[PDB]
Write a protein that binds this ligand. Structure first.
Ligand code: HEM
Ligand code: HEM
Lengths: 137, 137
């Protein structure tokens, strides 16, 4: 289930983080507007850039901490507040986060592994609702 | 304390993992016989190799999970058993792990950050004992 999935993701976090983020950017190419330094690069080019791997791993590390602190896939209000108030997230809307979790859930469903995709879907929905309550437009 | 230290390390894990592993290899140069592609290379040359960064980060991915699942710095017997039974650890003895944690604790003591170095020293001791109980010579 959810707790084992956090352990699975964390065990190879840079690889999963890159693969899922690439699935997100390829499914929703307009999202690269928020990441101008990734424009014009294939998946393997981005996976060779230490700054891409560093960024995505740090994102997914924070995601895993928020996931681990959740109860029954409900994140803490204070973690949503952290995500809304980060300077790097100013101007973002909840649709950006919604799209990231759609890509993550579809990645898990298409993997040959027994991820608890329903729990990640509910986690993403609950986090988006919390982000909105915490002030994200 | 110990739990916060896990979060600190995970927040910049590729850097910490490489730097701590280098401190281990430089304190105990004989240990490089287990890592023959790292012989004859300076620190900067190792940090340019994706193999070195990928290996050390996957090691620390798992080490942080083992630390995270511990209670009062006592690791799970299941985690010790996994570490003993991993094919990559065939022939290793608990002294190899002792030295890794000595280097880790010394790195923390020298860092200027408020790492809980005594808890990592205790964690290392308890892990060595649990490896022995799980059959490591
Ligand atoms: C649960 C979801 C997310 C988490 C946990 C998260 C976490 C983070 C973290 C930890 C950083 C700092 C990275 C670093 O210091 O290297 C960061 C930066 C950033 N995040 Fe997020 N993020 C999430 C979702 C998103 C989404 C959906 C977008 C846009 C579609 C976004 C846009 C950005 C941008 C633009 C930066 C700065 C990038 C840079 O300076 O290179 N984040 N995020
Ligand atoms: C708590 C401590 C440790 C953990 C969590 C750990 C974990 C791991 C992991 C996850 C791998 C696979 C990583 C990869 O794909 O390259 C690995 C491989 C390996 N480990 Fe460890 N390890 C630990 C301590 C040690 C020590 C102290 C030694 C030897 C002094 C050692 C020797 C090796 C070797 C030789 C490999 C194969 C590396 C390769 O083929 O690239 N490990 N270990």
């Amino acid at each position: 289930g959810f707790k084992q999935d956090i352990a699975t993701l964390r065990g190879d976090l840079r690889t999963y983080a890159q693969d899922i983020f690439l699935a997100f950017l390829n499914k929703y190419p307009d999202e690269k507007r928020n990441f101008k330094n990734y424009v014009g690069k294939s998946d393997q080019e981005l996976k060779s850039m230490a700054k891409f791997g560093d960024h995505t791993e740090k994102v997914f590390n924070l995601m895993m901490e928020v996931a681990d602190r959740a109860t029954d896939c409900v994140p803490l209000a204070s973690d949503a507040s952290t995500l809304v108030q980060m300077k790097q997230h100013s101007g973002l809307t909840t649709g950006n986060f919604e799209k990231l979790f759609v890509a993550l859930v579809e990645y898990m469903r298409a993997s040959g592994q027994s991820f608890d995709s329903q729990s990640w879907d509910r986690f993403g929905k609950n986090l988006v609702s919390a982000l909105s309550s915490a002030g994200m437009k």
